[PDB]
């Protein structure tokens, strides 16, 4: 009764930590999504609009 | 939220930059047409007023 007592504890300690890290594997992945888009929007727009512009 | 500051920034100046190239656009259509009109007219007028004049 003892063990089960360190055991009760260390099941609930492991959930916790797979917990934690399923909350920051939404939050890394939503910065890579966004860290994607904001590259090719910036880099896009730049080049086309001035490109364009200096060539008419 | 600061980088959304300088997107807003950035599109506004893209935009202004746009803007003025639209109204030198029109000014320089303009002169392009009127230049046109100008060396047509003068021409025309004096050659073929002094060489009938000076034939007849």
Redesign the interface.
């Known amino acids: 009764r003892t063990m089960s007592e360190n055991l009760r504890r260390n099941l609930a300690a492991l959930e916790a930590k797979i917990s934690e890290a399923k909350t920051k594997k939404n939050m890394l992945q939503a910065r890579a999504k966004a860290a994607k888009a ?1 590259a090719e929007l910036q880099q896009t ?1 730049a080049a086309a ?1 001035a490109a364009a ?1 200096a060539a008419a």
Chains 1, 2 share one sequence.
């Open positions: 904001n727009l609009a512009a």
